[PDB]
Amino acid sequence: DQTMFYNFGDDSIEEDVKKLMKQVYVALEEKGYNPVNQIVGYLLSGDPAYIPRHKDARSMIRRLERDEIIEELVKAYLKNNEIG
Amino acid sequence: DSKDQTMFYNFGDDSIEEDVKKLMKQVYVALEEKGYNPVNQIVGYLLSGDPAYIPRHKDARSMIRRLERDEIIEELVKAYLKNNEIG
């Protein structure tokens, strides 16, 4: 309900992960992968070889901590499931 | 207003989607009530598989026993793509 103050760079992890997931999804679909399968394999194993080099998806995903991507997945899930 | 027919040993009727929602709600409430950042405990659990990250509260520990982390992370990823209209 309450208005939030915006400080330049406030939403940087949320926005960073959103940008990354959009590009990673496109890279996976274009190369014929099951995007959910490959993202799960990467997040569980930390093995970047589950992500294509296509569209620089592998290098881009390696620039974020897996814990930061999982954090955003968890925060998004709670919010979209009205948990709070 | 939910119930269960006690007519054979039942190891659960919930779908994985239902189980993940129940786990995430129970853990969030338990941690939020006690002043913890719940997201950090859930993330630490998903990175490790160590139940010590999760409070012993209701059947939290029994829910993580029954779910695999690949299934929890699959549900998180599916939900994230859906809710951000990705694909």
Author numbering:
A (entry chain A): 5 to 88
B (entry chain B): 2 to 88
Quote the passages of the study that discuss this structure, keeping the authors' original sentences.
Homologues of the 90-residue ReoM protein are found across the entire Firmicute phylum, and include IreB, a substrate of the protein serine/threonine kinase IreK and its cognate phosphatase IreP from Enterococcus faecalis, whereas ReoY homologues are present only in the Bacilli. PrkA phosphorylates ReoM on Thr7 and PrpC reverses this reaction in vitro; ReoM phosphorylation at Thr7 in vivo has also been observed by phosphoproteomics. Our data are consistent with a model in which PrkA-phosphorylated ReoM no longer activates ClpCP, which leads to MurA stabilisation and the activation of PG biosynthesis.
Purified ReoM yielded crystals that diffracted to a maximum resolution of 1.6 Å. Other than IreB, there are no structural homologues of ReoM with functional significance in the PDB. The helical bundles in both ReoM and IreB associate into homodimers with α-helices two and four from each protomer forming the majority of the homodimer interface, and these residues are highlighted in Figure 6B. In agreement with the IreB structural analysis, 1200 Å2 of surface area is buried in the ReoM dimer interface, representing 9% of the total solvent accessible surface area. Other than the compact helical bundle of ReoM, there is a ~ 16 residue-long N-terminal tail, with B-factors 25% higher than the rest of the protein, prior to the start of α-helix one at residue Ile17. Consequently, it is possible to visualise Thr7, the target for phosphorylation by PrkA, in the flexible N-terminal region in both chains. The side chain of Thr7 in both chains makes no intramolecular interactions and is thus amenable to phosphorylation by PrkA. Alternatively, the presence of a sulphate ion (a component of the crystallisation reagent) adjacent to the sidechain of Thr7 could mimic what P-ReoM might look like. The sulphate ion is captured by a positively-charged micro-environment from a symmetry-equivalent molecule.
